Enzyme design. Structure first.
Site, PDB file in Angstrom:
ATOM      1  N   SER A  23     -35.228  19.697 -28.622  1.00 25.41           N
ATOM      2  CA  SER A  23     -35.727  20.976 -28.131  1.00 25.41           C
ATOM      3  C   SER A  23     -36.112  21.899 -29.285  1.00 25.41           C
ATOM      4  O   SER A  23     -35.442  21.937 -30.315  1.00 25.41           O
ATOM      5  CB  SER A  23     -34.674  21.660 -27.256  1.00 25.41           C
ATOM      6  OG  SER A  23     -34.303  20.839 -26.165  1.00 25.41           O
ATOM      7  N   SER A 101     -31.552  14.526 -29.204  1.00 23.37           N
ATOM      8  CA  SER A 101     -31.174  15.580 -28.270  1.00 23.37           C
ATOM      9  C   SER A 101     -31.938  15.437 -26.948  1.00 23.37           C
ATOM     10  O   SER A 101     -31.858  14.387 -26.309  1.00 23.37           O
ATOM     11  CB  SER A 101     -31.432  16.942 -28.921  1.00 23.37           C
ATOM     12  OG  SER A 101     -30.486  17.898 -28.485  1.00 23.37           O
ATOM     13  N   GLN A 102     -32.672  16.468 -26.523  1.00 20.55           N
ATOM     14  CA  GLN A 102     -33.416  16.353 -25.269  1.00 20.55           C
ATOM     15  C   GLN A 102     -34.301  15.104 -25.294  1.00 20.55           C
ATOM     16  O   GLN A 102     -34.575  14.500 -24.256  1.00 20.55           O
ATOM     17  CB  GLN A 102     -34.296  17.591 -25.004  1.00 20.55           C
ATOM     18  CG  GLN A 102     -35.072  17.451 -23.687  1.00 20.55           C
ATOM     19  CD  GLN A 102     -35.931  18.654 -23.309  1.00 20.55           C
ATOM     20  OE1 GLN A 102     -36.662  18.607 -22.316  1.00 20.55           O
ATOM     21  NE2 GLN A 102     -35.845  19.729 -24.084  1.00 20.55           N
ATOM     22  N   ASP A 156     -20.004  16.692 -31.539  1.00 24.15           N
ATOM     23  CA  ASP A 156     -21.277  16.995 -30.885  1.00 24.15           C
ATOM     24  C   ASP A 156     -21.017  16.901 -29.387  1.00 24.15           C
ATOM     25  O   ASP A 156     -21.079  15.823 -28.789  1.00 24.15           O
ATOM     26  CB  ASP A 156     -22.382  16.012 -31.281  1.00 24.15           C
ATOM     27  CG  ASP A 156     -23.733  16.418 -30.714  1.00 24.15           C
ATOM     28  OD1 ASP A 156     -23.751  17.328 -29.859  1.00 24.15           O
ATOM     29  OD2 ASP A 156     -24.766  15.840 -31.105  1.00 24.15           O
ATOM     30  N   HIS A 169     -24.137  18.648 -34.112  1.00 24.25           N
ATOM     31  CA  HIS A 169     -25.365  18.262 -33.432  1.00 24.25           C
ATOM     32  C   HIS A 169     -26.570  18.237 -34.365  1.00 24.25           C
ATOM     33  O   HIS A 169     -27.623  17.701 -34.011  1.00 24.25           O
ATOM     34  CB  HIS A 169     -25.647  19.223 -32.275  1.00 24.25           C
ATOM     35  CG  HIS A 169     -26.785  18.796 -31.403  1.00 24.25           C
ATOM     36  ND1 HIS A 169     -26.787  17.595 -30.726  1.00 24.25           N
ATOM     37  CD2 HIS A 169     -27.952  19.407 -31.091  1.00 24.25           C
ATOM     38  CE1 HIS A 169     -27.908  17.485 -30.034  1.00 24.25           C
ATOM     39  NE2 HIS A 169     -28.631  18.571 -30.238  1.00 24.25           N
TER      40      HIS A 169
END
Length: 187
Positions: A23, A101-102, A156, A169
């Site tokens: 993101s 991530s996303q 994370d 993260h």
């Protein structure tokens, strides 16, 4: 554009690396783990790697993380189409993929919808800060576990079924070398 759109720009390469960014990251490959892995593959297999990021339909916006599958349906559809395009446009290419991530939600959502024939073309996938780790039990649904390597740093929390973002993260650059070696090994 020179980087991140190599599948669409052609020519076909022996290896096609498809990556979904995290993101807020700009562009196609993002500015962190995506370029890091892409470049390592390019050094290990000089002149034989095409890196393709999932975009522009996948906007990598923050709100989409809260949607059912952890990302937008548009991003999933775009990624799915890129995998299918790789196999059709470049019948001899071997695919490796990754997400951050996303982006890992995009990868899980797209790859689990692929046909067996296309999945067989995907030799390996690396997922940094896998937001669907808990929900998918450390793998990608309807896809071989041995073809996926998940990097979930201690602390994370996105790997624990939450969307809480903590410092760990953003510690994945240190795992890009291992991830690249994994992909090369799968090839």
């Amino acid at each position: 554009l020179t980087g991140g759109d190599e599948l669409r720009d052609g020519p076909c390469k022996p290896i096609t690396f498809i990556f979904a960014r995290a993101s807020t990251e700009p562009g196609l490959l993002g500015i962190s783990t995506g370029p890091a892995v892409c470049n390592r593959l390019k050094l290990a297999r000089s002149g034989d790697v095409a890196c393709q990021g999932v975009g522009p339909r996948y906007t990598a916006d923050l709100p989409s993380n809260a949607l059912p599958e952890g990302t937008s349906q548009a991003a999933i559809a775009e990624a799915q189409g890129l995998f299918e395009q790789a196999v059709s446009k470049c019948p001899d290419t071997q695919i490796v993929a990754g997400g951050y991530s996303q982006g890992t939600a995009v990868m899980n959502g797209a790859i689990k919808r692929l046909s067996a024939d296309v999945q067989d073309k995907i030799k390996g996938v690396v997922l940094f800060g896998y937001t669907r780790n808990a929900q998918e039990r450390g793998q990608i649904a309807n896809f071989p576990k041995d073809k996926v390597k998940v990097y979930c740093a201690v602390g994370d929390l996105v790997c624990l079924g939450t969307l809480i973002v903590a410092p760990p993260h953003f510690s994945y650059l240190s795992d890009t070398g291992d991830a690249s070696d994994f992909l090369l090994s799968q090839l």
